[PDB]
Amino acid sequence: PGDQICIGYHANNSTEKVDTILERNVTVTHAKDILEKTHNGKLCKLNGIPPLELGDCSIAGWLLGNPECDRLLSVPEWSYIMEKENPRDGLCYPGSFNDYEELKHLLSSVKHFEKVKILPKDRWTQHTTTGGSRACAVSGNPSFFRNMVWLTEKGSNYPVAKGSYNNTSGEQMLIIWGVHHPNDETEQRTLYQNVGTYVSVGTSTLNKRSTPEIATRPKVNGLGGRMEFSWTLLDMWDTINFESTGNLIAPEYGFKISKRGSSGIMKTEGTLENCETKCQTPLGAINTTLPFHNVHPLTIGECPKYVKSEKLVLATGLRNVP
Amino acid sequence: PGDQICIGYHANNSTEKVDTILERNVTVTHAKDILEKTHNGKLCKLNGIPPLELGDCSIAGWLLGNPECDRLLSVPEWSYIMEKENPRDGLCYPGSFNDYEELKHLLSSVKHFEKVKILPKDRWTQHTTTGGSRACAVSGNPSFFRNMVWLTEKGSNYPVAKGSYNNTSGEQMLIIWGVHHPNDETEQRTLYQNVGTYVSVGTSTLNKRSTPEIATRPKVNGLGGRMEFSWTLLDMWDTINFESTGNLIAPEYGFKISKRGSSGIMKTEGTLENCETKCQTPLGAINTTLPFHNVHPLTIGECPKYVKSEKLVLATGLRNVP
Amino acid sequence: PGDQICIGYHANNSTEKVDTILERNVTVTHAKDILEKTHNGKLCKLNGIPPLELGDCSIAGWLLGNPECDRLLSVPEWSYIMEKENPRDGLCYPGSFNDYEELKHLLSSVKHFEKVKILPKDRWTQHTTTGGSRACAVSGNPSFFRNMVWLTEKGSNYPVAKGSYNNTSGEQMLIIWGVHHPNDETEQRTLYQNVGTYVSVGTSTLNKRSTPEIATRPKVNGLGGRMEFSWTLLDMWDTINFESTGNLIAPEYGFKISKRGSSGIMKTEGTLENCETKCQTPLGAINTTLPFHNVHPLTIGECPKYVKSEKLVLATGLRNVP
Amino acid sequence: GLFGAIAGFIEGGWQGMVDGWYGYHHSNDQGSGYAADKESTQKAFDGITNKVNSVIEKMNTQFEAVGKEFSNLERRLENLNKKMEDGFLDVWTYNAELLVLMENERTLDFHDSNVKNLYDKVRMQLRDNVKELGNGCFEFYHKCDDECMNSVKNGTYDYPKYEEESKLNRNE
Amino acid sequence: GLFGAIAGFIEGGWQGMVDGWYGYHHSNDQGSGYAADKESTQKAFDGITNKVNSVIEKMNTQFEAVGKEFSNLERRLENLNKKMEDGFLDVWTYNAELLVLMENERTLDFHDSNVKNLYDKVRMQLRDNVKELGNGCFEFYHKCDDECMNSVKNGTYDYPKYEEESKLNRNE
Amino acid sequence: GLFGAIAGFIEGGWQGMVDGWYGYHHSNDQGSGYAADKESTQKAFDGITNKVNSVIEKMNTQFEAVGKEFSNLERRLENLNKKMEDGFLDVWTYNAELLVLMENERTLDFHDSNVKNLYDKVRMQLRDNVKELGNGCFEFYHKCDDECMNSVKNGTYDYPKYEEESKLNRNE
Numbered sequence A, B, C: 001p002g003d004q005i006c007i008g009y010h011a012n013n014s015t016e017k018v019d020t021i022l023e024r025n026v027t028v029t030h031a032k033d034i035l036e037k038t039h040n041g042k043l044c045k046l047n048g049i050p051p052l053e054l055g056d057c058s059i060a061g062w063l064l065g066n067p068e069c070d071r072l073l074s075v076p077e078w079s080y081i082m083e084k085e086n087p088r089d090g091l092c093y094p095g096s097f098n099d100y101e102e103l104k105h106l107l108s109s110v111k112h113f114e115k116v117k118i119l120p121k122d123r124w125t126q127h128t129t130t131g132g133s134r135a136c137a138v139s140g141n142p143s144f145f146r147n148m149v150w151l152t153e154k155g156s157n158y159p160v161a162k163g164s165y166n167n168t169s170g171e172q173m174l175i176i177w178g179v180h181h182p183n184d185e186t187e188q189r190t191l192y193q194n195v196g197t198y199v200s201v202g203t204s205t206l207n208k209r210s211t212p213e214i215a216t217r218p219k220v221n222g223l224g225g226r227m228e229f230s231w232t233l234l235d236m237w238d239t240i241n242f243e244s245t246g247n248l249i250a251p252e253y254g255f256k257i258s259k260r261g262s263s264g265i266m267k268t269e270g271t272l273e274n275c276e277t278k279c280q281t282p283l284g285a286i287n288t289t290l291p292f293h294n295v296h297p298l299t300i301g302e303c304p305k306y307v308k309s310e311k312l313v314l315a316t317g318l319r320n321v322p
Numbered sequence D, E, F: 001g002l003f004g005a006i007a008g009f010i011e012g013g014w015q016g017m018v019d020g021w022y023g024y025h026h027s028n029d030q031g032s033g034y035a036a037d038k039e040s041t042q043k044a045f046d047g048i049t050n051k052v053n054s055v056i057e058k059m060n061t062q063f064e065a066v067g068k069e070f071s072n073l074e075r076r077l078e079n080l081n082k083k084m085e086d087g088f089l090d091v092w093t094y095n096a097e098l099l100v101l102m103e104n105e106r107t108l109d110f111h112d113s114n115v116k117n118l119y120d121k122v123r124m125q126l127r128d129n130v131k132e133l134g135n136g137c138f139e140f141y142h143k144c145d146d147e148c149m150n151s152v153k154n155g156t157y158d159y160p161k162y163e164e165e166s167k168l169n170r171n172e
């Protein structure tokens, strides 16, 4: 037996495991977990900008001005929009909203509106505008969508109703209008005096028209009538013209797009908490430097890449050998 | 020369070949084919449940009740639906079917209906209901879609036609109705007496209406007239109201969705054979434990993963060396 | 010291670099660049067949026959269609074109039309057909889309207008028609005498109808009126019937599909040059044997595979060692 | 191959060795014959079994085409649907084919490594009591009966035991 | 493993060697102890650092789901959207999982190669001045003090210097 | 590298060896010079040619973007189309880039393996008729003229022929 030199490798107390193609559950001296699995369970400001919390209101309830949504009558810039799965406060007067999903999609790239009084209500001097319904009641009295005007007979007459607006606002403007489809003809005559009425809307590109439909339907919010809403984006310097002999639900306001950018509607039942994040999911906010996460596919902000994986651990060291 | 020990490896009679990146057509001692390329060329029961064989009928011919489809008037639960590419027996009275592809898509998750007599024909006491056409003839006499009612003048009058149905059936219910668009005004007056008629339909969510169009068109199945069908899914506890002064094609029945699950419409010219499978393709049934197949992309049941590959053979043994 | 033999490897003057997972910027003796990064900056004939250069015309301007597009009145087979982003010459009389994007998509598989005079203008003996507008003026005089006929009052009458065409042409035929929506009722009476008019169109499968809408709109090309165009593909041996008491914009021609195949509309502001290619991009033509390119995703012809990569270099030789 | 043994310095395989992938051939006064190395064969078997399971399992979350229909006025939508379903089909065909090619390469090289490692283990045990012929064989500088051969095969060869006999034989 | 050193002929690791992945254990008259090979450790460290960065960077152009809504009469479109977003999700999950498995394999084999190459470097320097025991150790045919041990560790061993002492010891 | 030869124990390449990837340098009384090993070079060439063809061919079933247009009321559909075409683009860019990186790694290691295997073949043929210097060279214990050098290069070296001259030289 003589002097010796031996060649060898590191071992330690690590119990970190990795998988390979050939072998599973291999213990290694060093490893790097590249998958974020945690979140704070909260809805937060995104880079210090809070979301728009609709609460019990839908997108339609907000923009039309359902009186249960009055807290939303003027809202500042947002980073994302929180909407419940089945918001209670939408179309208080029942009906429909044409191309509603398209409108929601637009909202994904809008971060602020300026509401502009495009067709002030007091300028309809030839028609009654104090029209409302118990279905949109406020303090036990009939009322109506705050942003809209229900034109009805004045002094037993309904002259041809004309309004127009040139978009001088400096940005594209979202404008909504409706047509009332009555339950019966007593309703039609009491409200509009006229029969065989029409609602016409025209811009440089839109020529969308309507004849109201009178017809018995099951009651929704107590009413068999319906209001069918439609919308358009009015380009800068273009004009919208409304024309009607009955059944027009006119906008009083338009929503000028005042800020654009990546946003989104998050479906959540939760409420905003006093917290800050760069990456928001519907389950909660992520704060990580890791490249992947498995929290939720629908994220907003500066986020890691979502994968379905339960684990992603890269070996960096060598097989840890007893 | 002295005693020897030698180190070496297995060889055998295998002619199994595999490919690698560096080399092709390598012979190996052992290999595992992971690609199923065979099927039995038959359409079969899927886990003992037979498909719905439409034969020469389309989905529309079935649900409307084209008299050539009478074998389908009551059908039990199915595992998939077989439909030909161009079924002969569809709209016997020519016309159109609004959102037809959407209806077919619904059928992908429906495995059974219960047909319910929602608006019994004998209750239209103010109108003739024995209306039919040679295009839907039965035994040489004019007839009509079995599930539908063509309301016409009675005693030279057509009073306002009203029917309604509350869905108390316990599940959502598919309901179809139509509007007749006549060829000419002699037709309109002989059938409906009235002119400037309408068909209105309303539920809690649908307000879909119609004015019939009178107009010359090329003959289809001998007729220049058309019937335009529409459909809705009536929710549990909701009511549908029909209202008309002419041209309504009323449903007598609704189809309650009685079983839901993964299904599908398979396009095939073939017929069901007495065989059983867990995995059906339009070309034939697959019976394999292999993870991949290349038979057809459109499969129903518990199937391997489809790839376009002509071969997938994994080497398991070593290079087989002479 | 004695005689020696040494084992070793090639080195050379190569400065070609490749990357690996473990190392970057490795110098190798030999390498293969598999990514084409160059193009000739020109729009060219594709296999000797020139594109259809619309110039300032849109697809609609061409097919309707805007008088600014007269060079396109008869065009030979093309290999792709060049269209500008915002062509000036489209609907000279302002309006809309229903399912326009669907029509453009059809054009992706059409390589030639034969324009067929299906409803010769001189056969409308009961109506004026010399109708036109300053918005479509030619030589300072009112005119109109060359392929269309604006039927108006003759001798203060507008009798029911009927035309029909059986497609005996030997292929499917694209047919366009329109409805005029006037600005006001003076316009309607001066042009059509009649009020409460209609435009009806019917084939074996299409039953599409219209009532013109009279309504004030902002001026486009000086006009508040609109023309709303629609189209259909008329099958071989099928018949189209037009019927109107006012406001019909009739086709005089149909476009028989005379050649089919892979084509496409390329969006470009450029002009065709005297050059030949097998692979055209909007940026310029590619001439390569390399399997990948990074020039542009939207190519026409026999092309390499597009990737976003800035580099794809495969090592073929060994590490080049000093 | 990468490790230089299979179809390498060990120029051919053994039809005579039927019960394993790797092993031995011995030759002495008592006679000759074949025998598989059970440990190395089993280690490789376990690896390969794990390999096949892994390739399969990674392609269980794979796209499925779902039958849908479109109108003659929904051609763009139909084309989108077709491009998508075809697109995923092509991705997964690529994934399956590539994976199998890459892993087949590594499978052949794995067996090559296994043979080389077994060779080297025996080499490092026998040391200079044998001549390394260059063909996978070691020729003994001493007589090595069945008991001796068995000790080499289960890694218990007594180098010191034969050292003197070998050094004497080797040094003449 | 592929290169036969780690959990191979070098049967176990060293808890005693704390400041590197690979290195030495020496034993003489002056005493004994451990020491990491800094060059080989650093080369491996750089490679591994490059590896992790590469796997991450290749999956930065990865699909994102974008929230959209559909009507009750747009079920096909909704299904198309769902199939697409799920489809890319499954592709990228596959890419991430596979990449990590394949690269983990190669990472373990890389360290194995690094150990074997270090062993062979020392072997090729010491030559027949040492006995190769078969366990990662070389036993010297001469006395090799700390200075001598240090020369081996930094690749400056003087074969000729000890040649005569070794040949004399080796040849008896 | 993985096999320890290239930029390894064979520390540098040869500008002098122009007609192959791997080969020999000989030195005797008749003079000196370079010569490529044709067999090993050709085997590698065939492999590499197969490799490039495979990487290309596996990405021939690759997604193509097809130009479509959408109305201002089809923004969701337009976005779906864009997300899809971008999504496949990103998948195929990933596939191409990754494949090239992984295969480049294996290409360099393949050449390294090829050099090591050629070295070992010569080593195993020359045996103890030469000294293994540790730098890719074998120094002969006998005189080895051009004919002798040629026999080594085509694997027909006569160990027994030079055995006696070598043992005599080696043993003094």
Ligand SMILES: *[C@@H]1O[C@H](CO)[C@@H](O[C@@H]2O[C@H](CO)[C@@H](O)[C@H](O)[C@H]2NC(C)=O)[C@H](O)[C@H]1NC(C)=O
Pocket (backbone or CB within 6 Å): A166, A167, A168, A237, A238, A239, C218
């Ligand atoms: C609507 O208002 C605008 C702004 O007053 C009108 O004026 C012009 O339109 C352009 C559009 O590019 C504006 O940017 C300019 O401020 C105006 N140009 C000039 C030369 O004054 C526009 O005319 C109005 N529309 C109508 C129907 O009168």
Ligand SMILES: *[C@@H]1O[C@H](CO)[C@@H](O[C@@H]2O[C@H](CO)[C@@H](O)[C@H](O)[C@H]2NC(C)=O)[C@H](O)[C@H]1NC(C)=O
Pocket (backbone or CB within 6 Å): A218, B166, B167, B168, B237, B238, B239
């Ligand atoms: C339609 O029929 C249903 C069942 O009779 C009616 O009754 C209520 O509706 C609820 C819906 O959630 C049913 O589940 C209950 O059976 C009923 N509730 C009560 C308190 O009786 C419903 O009212 C009918 N619709 C109309 C228009 O009368």
Ligand SMILES: *[C@@H]1O[C@H](CO)[C@@H](O[C@@H]2O[C@H](CO)[C@@H](O)[C@H](O)[C@H]2NC(C)=O)[C@H](O)[C@H]1NC(C)=O
Pocket (backbone or CB within 6 Å): B218, C166, C167, C168, C237, C238, C239
């Ligand atoms: C339209 O024209 C065609 C061709 O003249 C008419 O004739 C038949 O239709 C078939 C369709 O498959 C043609 O291919 C044949 O040339 C014709 N068959 C026979 C037996 O003559 C068709 O009838 C015309 N349509 C109308 C409404 O009359």
Ligand SMILES: *[C@@H]1O[C@H](CO)[C@@H](O)[C@H](O)[C@H]1NC(C)=O
Pocket (backbone or CB within 6 Å): A025
């Ligand atoms: C991994 O190995 C550990 C010990 O090395 C063992 O306890 C366990 O069974 C393995 N992990 C699992 C849960 O498969």
Ligand SMILES: *[C@@H]1O[C@H](CO)[C@@H](O)[C@H](O)[C@H]1NC(C)=O
Pocket (backbone or CB within 6 Å): B025
């Ligand atoms: C594969 O090899 C066999 C014999 O080893 C040969 O006959 C054949 O040409 C090869 N296969 C094909 C069809 O390429």
Ligand SMILES: *[C@@H]1O[C@H](CO)[C@@H](O)[C@H](O)[C@H]1NC(C)=O
Pocket (backbone or CB within 6 Å): C025
């Ligand atoms: C690659 O290496 C070269 C020299 O070998 C060096 O000049 C350069 O920094 C490297 N390339 C880049 C731009 O990273």
